[PDB]
Design a protein around this ligand. Structure first.
Ligand code: LFA
Ligand code: LFA
Ligand code: LFA
Ligand code: FE
Ligand code: FE
Ligand code: FE
Ligand code: FE
Ligand code: FE
Lengths: 164, 164, 164, 164, 164, 164
């Protein structure tokens, strides 16, 4: 039997599908960077996409751990074009901040229901979101200091292309 | 400059999006097996989902190798339920055979345009499809011999749950 | 269900039986060389016979991979005598060319039916036939320069007797 | 000079050709098991076929050791269908017993001619036949206890599929 | 005896000589880069010249494999000078695209003659050409971003100078 | 600025192009030996050709070390038919002696202009030419003793085919 409420279950399932979209969005940023010839930035985005899938799968497994079931929904078509390298990363930061607020909404919902198990499960994503936002802000700071100079952009493209 | 025709480029991009859906479909079959309590079958489908992503990324990189560009499209909601283990794998076989026919269509299109580079690139997928169909047919044959016997279904579950 | 046409399955099954005969013929060339006291040439022919069996089993497994079935037919009696070492290799070359044309006929039949999976599977044998024909032409060219000189035939026998 | 009588050479050469047919018969049993979807039983039959070839080559080398020569004959078409797993292994047992009696017949002919070298050479095959018959009787005994229960057949298929 | 048509042997021998010129052209681009003081770009061109020689030798060995012989022709004087770093690489890309179409022409000729051995042999060069064209396009894209800035050109020189 | 005289740079550039032709000539002797079926002699010529390229590149790098520039010239069509094995190696000796005399002419020109750096650089080639002439003279002496005997020519072919 399911030991999460149907509201909490739906919120977790909604977030799972939101995490799938996050993965798709970053792949679409890879398609942009590859079109612009920045294979290192594209590689970073491909790695980021795979990292979002592991986020989706940890929502996946917690739902089944609490006796729930996952239902996959349609994934909306992501943007595919940005006005420059910085515009794509600014869009990524705005998306991660939106993801953080979506995690907060589940946390507050689970808290109102005294679903302590789900509140505590979500804390990993709270801490992880602090990292994901910080890593994009750091990239944005390096792009702002580069100020469009291709010598510095090349060094950061190769650097982000070294992602593990 | 793009050295594939727009027609061939669109055929390859369409197939990339079909591989994305294929991955999503197998993940949704995993959600079905996990809801039914068959963690080994669900594990098999998760491994299958990741294999489809490598198919999409192969199309991805070939498109850019020939000067094209990838555009990600919306992904349709896959089914989430099947009338049994055999029904799910029969749906899997029918989908893989459909995937093979779609690859065949790109091959014949590239062939009539004398796009030998794309014809030759597609050979890996032709050979790979032979094995994808054969492994589902083997599973279906084993499920047919099991004939609903739970002791034998349990053997098949943990066996497929060992997937590499 | 079988996903090769009955025409294509019959062509592959016919070739499987042809590969069995090719194996048998080379064993019968071994019986001739051993009767003549040339154990190195005989050893080469025994290794050649085993190589043909691996070709036959490759056809075997591809047929079942495509949902077909193998039927073994009677194997005709091969010749057991040749007019010297060079005559035997002339027969080997003539046989290998016949095998190559038989592979070609399956390839053209599969291509007419747009059976791309079988066309691509047969590529390995086209390439292998290039090597097998070349191996015998090289031996024949050496025998033509040898002109029957026993010192040269002995070293060639010892060398071919070293085949792994 | 040949130091076996022609009668004994013909007996040994006839048996060599019988071993070739035995190999072909077991390969044909593999085509049956593979058509029935029992890849472990099929694997067992493919290994049995290669072992029969080593028997043929043992007769081969002894014939030449005694100054005789081997003549390969036509290989009859083996049956390709059986009425079940038990029926195939029963046919295998009946064939191995027939092979044993054929070896016994050479032994008695050689001993009548006081060909002690051939009498002694055949001792290895007498002993080998004891094991070949016993290995099939053991398989038949397990199939009789299994009585068609797929739970037991699956494990026996995988077990025989491990034959080295 | 030659088992390729004389038309195909001439097409292959012509392409071998074209590969020889290709190495010479790249060596001549090296002389240009070395005169301009870019040892990394020159090093890249010297590696490219040796790669073209391995292409010529592949054609060489296949011609003899099929019973033909190679005839070397005069090598035309390549251009010595270019209007800049980008101008040289644009000429290289235009040449590689010309080499690809010449290979395409041999494939279509062999295919029309049903010379499946040569058709299948040429697939390696089709695939290699995709890599050769792409490698130069990437360099041209990086040179376009450099926009003449010596700070960025020094990065590309050192980077291309690390080619193995 | 260029610190070799224009006369010395041209003499060196001419010799560079001469070394390219020597490489091409030896490749063409390889085409002859391969057409005649002597893969060992052909192997020797292929190694010699690659050795001539390192000679050319040594001239290449010294020219730029002295501030000069390399200009590649047209390469003449080499001969492709010799009367026999010994005639080809006799032509190889004759060519190397011509190369040695061409090096002598540069050395005497450099010494007259008091270009001690070029005089000292050319000593490596003086000593190297002594070795290259000597190794062809040794092969010719063995071919003269063979006196056309194919058993002995085969031994020399195998021996020269072991060249590293
Ligand atoms: C080498 C680069 C890899 C990039 C991967 C990009 C993935 C994008 C995925 C979009 C969503 C489609 C459905 C994915 C299901 C994945 C299931 C994984 C189970 C472990
Ligand atoms: C030196 C051995 C030469 C043998 C020639 C035999 C020609 C007739 C063969 C008939 C039976 C063939 C059985 C082959 C079994 C191969 C199993 C391989 C499994 C991967
Ligand atoms: C590192 C510089 C390379 C420059 C190559 C220039 C080539 C010009 C053509 C001259 C003849 C080349 C002969 C090459 C023979 C190679 C044989 C290889 C055998 C495996
Ligand atoms: Fe996330
Ligand atoms: Fe796929
Ligand atoms: Fe074969
Ligand atoms: Fe090339
Ligand atoms: Fe030289």
């Amino acid at each position: 039997m399911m030991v999460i409420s149907e509201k909490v279950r739906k919120a977790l399932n909604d977030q799972l599908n939101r995490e799938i979209y996050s993965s798709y969005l970053y792949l679409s940023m890879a398609t942009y960077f590859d079109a612009e010839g920045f294979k290192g930035f594209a590689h970073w985005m491909k790695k980021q996409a795979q990292e979002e899938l592991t986020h989706a799968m940890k929502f996946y497994e917690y739902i089944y751990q609490r006796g729930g079931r996952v239902e996959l929904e349609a994934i909306e078509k992501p943007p595919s074009n940005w006005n420059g390298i910085k515009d794509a990363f600014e869009a990524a930061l705005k998306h991660e901040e939106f993801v953080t607020q979506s995690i907060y909404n589940i946390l507050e919902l689970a808290s109102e229901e005294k679903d302590h198990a789900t509140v505590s499960f979500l804390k990993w994503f709270v801490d992880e979101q602090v990292e994901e936002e910080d890593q994009v802000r750091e990239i944005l700071d390096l792009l702002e200091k580069a100020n469009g100079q291709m010598s510095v952009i090349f060094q950061l493209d190769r650097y982000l292309g070294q992602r593990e």
